[PDB]
Amino acid sequence: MRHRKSGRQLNRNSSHRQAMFRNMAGSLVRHEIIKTTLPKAKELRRVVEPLITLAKTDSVANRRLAFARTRDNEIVAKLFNELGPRFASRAGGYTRILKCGFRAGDNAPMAYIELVDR
Amino acid sequence: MIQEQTMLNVADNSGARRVMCIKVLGGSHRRYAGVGDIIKITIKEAIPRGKVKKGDVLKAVVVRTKKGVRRPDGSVIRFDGNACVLLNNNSEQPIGTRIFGPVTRELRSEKFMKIISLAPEVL
């Protein structure tokens, strides 16, 4: 039974999932569009969208909180100086998932995920 | 939740210091004994000049449980250790003359009217 539960396990342990979505969040902020599988792009929205709601208010305490969840300063400097100002008048829904074909090597359903203004 | 092989402290002045439950009386395949339930015990430790000797087989009544009792408004009253009062095998009247520590209102009936009379505190 998994009644009323959230989060996908994605065939990893607890610390591999946290390290994968942290690298993958730094790849979507940096490039503004990446191509992943469809179950990973759906679980990415729960990671990368709270980072942009964090980055709408500028303070030193919030920058130290978005550094503890990204571990990169090239990403924190872009969230607060670029993505904060853009999404400052939008109430959620900063990403967009576009389904595409299947992967050649294992027939996985792939999908693009992009920040909503490009 | 007292069951068989459970070692209980003793809450009267009969002389016994630790007794072990050897039977839960009052039903077939019966498992547990809450507060106010007769058990059949054996004496494991005793002071030298008490009324009972180590090795005797007696009856008892459970007066405190670590599992605790529940009140009709949902409240719970727990204790830090299981305790009991030694009864006579046949008359089922308490052997001792004093009760130590608090007891509960689950003993308030005609069967155990002499235990909540000697009790220092009833919760």
């Binding site: 039974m1 009644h3 | 009709p72 408004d73 949902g74």
Partner: protein, 209 residues
């Protein structure tokens, strides 16, 4: 007596002034509009058919919307039937309120259980597990033996085995009606009724003495 159709809202507690905890289940019994009345000369048996709630007008199909427009009632979310007793009569379109249970002391509530999926024999049939230690080889929660030898040489029908548990209609009988709240369409029964929050319940008065 006929019953009503409701919805399990969830559990709460009712405090009485003598200090008692009563676990009640809240059932939102909206008005039950009668859709069709069955009789002996046309249907072989006497019953009424009620609907409750409301449905989206773009979701009702053409066969269903014609069945409601014959009665004049508005389209609810389902259709249930109730067998009439000797002396009860209802009319098409009449709405039945929760005041049917005003002086009823006990009710039977039937619903669809929670789904536990494919459950093994320890969860489903309360079997005993075997030893977790002492030499056991890959056989801790398995059923064990399922028959006898050459006689009969088969497993009997109705053998207790692992399979789908829950998600089935069960009836819980003789629940105390604690409080009927007619002005906001509530019914507080005493105890646990089957089903998850938001599921349909059928509340009939108690048939046992």
């Amino acid at each position: 007596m006929i019953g009503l159709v409701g919805k399990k809202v969830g559990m709460t507690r009712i405090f009485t002034e003598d200090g008692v905890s009563i676990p009640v289940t809240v059932i939102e019994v909206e008005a039950n509009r009668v859709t069709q009345v069955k009789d002996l000369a046309n249907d072989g048996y006497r019953a009424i058919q009620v609907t409750t709630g409301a449905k989206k007008a773009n979701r009702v199909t053409k066969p269903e919307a014609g069945h409601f427009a014959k009665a004049g009632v508005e389209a609810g979310r389902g259709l249930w039937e109730f067998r009439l007793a000797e002396g009860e009569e209802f009319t098409v379109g009449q709405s039945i309120s929760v005041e049917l249970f005003a002086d009823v002391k006990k009710v039977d509530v039937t619903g669809t259980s929670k789904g536990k999926g494919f459950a093994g024999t320890v969860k489903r049939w309360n079997f005993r597990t075997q030893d977790a230690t002492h030499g056991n080889s890959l056989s801790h929660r398995v059923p064990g033996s399922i028959g006898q030898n050459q006689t009969p040489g088969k497993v009997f029908k109705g053998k207790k085995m692992a399979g789908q548990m829950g998600n089935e209609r069960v009836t819980v009988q003789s629940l105390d009606v604690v409080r009927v709240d007619a002005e906001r369409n509530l019914l507080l029964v005493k105890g646990a009724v089957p089903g998850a929050t938001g599921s349909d319940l059928i509340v009939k008065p108690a048939v046992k003495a």
